[PDB]
């Protein structure tokens, strides 16, 4: 498809050889279509954890070590170990995320991860039994005014929805804990997503703000 | 739960007890039938003079609207309820408030282009853009101490909400069809009953389409 050409082109810029570019391509294609596995790596990056592992038979085992002290990352995939810098590790993931990660439909209802809130906010929601649920209002919004990065979703807390007296919320994908129910989608949405949120953003080198491509 | 609350709202009407009871049975039937109730709202907005449906009991519900006379005739079980236009709007407003279903958040709807921007419909037709929208908010109050709500707050699909694409305030009769309902659970059911029905009843807050004052 079109995304495969664009994806291999985003791998040319990494300071690595063509042997490792093919390996990173296969790892990215495999992790991106497995949505639960890719979010686990994002949370590992967010917490600066040290290790990621999503092993399996038939040559599906993937292990990633993040050596935060030496700004090094080791991506092992079928006895082929790929080394690259931490900044190149984030660029690889950012363009994997831009071009290959599924985008949730509008109106999707999700449960967010309370482990990412300040304690005073958690204890306030717990007092009244408010679970951390939300609905997708918008997707991959451009951060103004420079418009050099996007953020994955704009949401409102469920069941209150969008209100006049409360702001919509910008959040990243790693805030999501589970999808309760996806919203409506069809061929119009798939074409719009591919054009506006993948191809047009790739052309302007707009990626998700969490990978912090400076 | 809500049956005795609906009976209370019929005390806002200047009709006899027998007429209140007839209006109760008509409203219990219409609000259960989402498409039938929306058809009546659309007949109201168009100022048509006749409405014809069949209650769940089977008896036909006949409504005659005399706009220059500012009164209405509701016919059910051979009973003719004569009421003013304002009592008609109040009856329907509390029927809607207390009994009409509320679409889940995230529901996808098709908007009737007639009730939408008149000539701008041509603009989205030029690009083949269908009139699909996502429910983002429900029974919205724009500010404090507002005595009326807006049925739904929606964003055009597939663009959604963004800083440069404002959402749209719509009434339930803006909906041509519901394409896919969003997620709902007990949390939503409890919040809908408490905030959008019981609390709005206590404050005399009904849909703005009825324009009671």
């Amino acid at each position: 498809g079109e995304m495969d050409i664009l994806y291999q082109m985003s791998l040319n810029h990494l300071a690595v050889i063509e042997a490792d570019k093919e390996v990173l391509k296969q790892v990215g294609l495999s992790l991106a279509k497995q949505e639960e596995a890719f979010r686990e790596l994002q949370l590992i990056l967010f917490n600066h954890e040290h290790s990621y592992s999503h092993h399996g038979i038939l040559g599906s085992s993937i292990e990633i070590l993040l050596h935060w002290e030496q700004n090094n990352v080791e991506v092992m995939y079928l006895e082929t170990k790929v080394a690259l810098s931490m900044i190149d590790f984030r660029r690889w993931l950012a363009y994997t995320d831009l071009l290959l990660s599924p985008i949730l439909p509008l109106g999707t209802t999700i449960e967010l991860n309370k482990d990412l809130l300040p304690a005073a906010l958690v204890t306030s929601m717990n007092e009244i039994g408010m679970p951390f649920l939300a609905i997708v209002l918008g997707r991959r919004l451009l951060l103004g005014p420079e418009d050099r990065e996007y953020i994955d979703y704009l949401v409102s807390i469920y069941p209150y929805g969008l209100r006049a007296d409360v702001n919509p919320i910008y959040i990243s994908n790693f805030f999501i804990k589970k999808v309760l129910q996806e919203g409506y989608s069809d061929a119009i949405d798939e074409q719009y997503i591919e054009n506006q949120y993948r191809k047009d953003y790739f052309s302007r080198n707009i990626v998700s703000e969490i990978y912090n491509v400076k | 739960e809500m049956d005795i609350l609906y009976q209370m709202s019929l005390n806002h009407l200047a009709v006899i007890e027998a007429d209140k009871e007839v209006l109760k049975q008509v409203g219990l039937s219409l609000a259960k039938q989402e498409e039938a109730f929306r058809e009546l709202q659309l007949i109201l907005f168009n100022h048509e003079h006749s409405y014809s449906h069949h209650g769940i009991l089977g008896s036909s519900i006949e409504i005659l609207l005399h706009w220059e006379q500012n009164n209405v005739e509701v016919m059910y079980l051979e009973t003719k309820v004569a009421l003013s236009m304002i009592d008609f709007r109040r009856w329907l407003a509390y029927t809607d408030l207390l009994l009409s279903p509320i679409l889940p958040l995230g529901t996808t709807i098709e908007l009737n282009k007639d009730l939408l921007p008149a000539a701008l419909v041509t603009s989205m037709n030029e690009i083949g853009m269908p009139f699909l929208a996502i429910v983002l908010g429900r029974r919205l109050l724009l500010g404090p101490e507002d005595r009326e709500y807006i049925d739904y707050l929606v964003s055009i699909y597939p663009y959604g909400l963004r800083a440069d694409v404002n959402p749209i305030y719509i009434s339930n009769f803006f909906i041509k069809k519901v394409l896919q309902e969003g997620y709902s659970d007990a949390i939503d059911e409890q919040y809908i009953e408490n905030q959008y029905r019981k609390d709005y009843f206590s404050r005399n807050i009904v849909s703005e389409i009825y324009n009671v004052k």
């Binding site: 719009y192 054009n195 506006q196 047009d200 | 939408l116 921007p117 008149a118 701008l120 603009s123 989205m124 690009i127 853009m129 055009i156 663009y159 963004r162 440069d164 694409v165 404002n166 959402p167 749209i168 305030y169 719509i170």
Partner: peptide
């Protein structure tokens, strides 16, 4: 150029 911002802002300006 995949989002017609001006037409979408016009739909909302009118109905609101």
């Amino acid at each position: 150029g995949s989002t017609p911002v001006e037409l979408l802002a016009n739909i909302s300006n009118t109905l609101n």
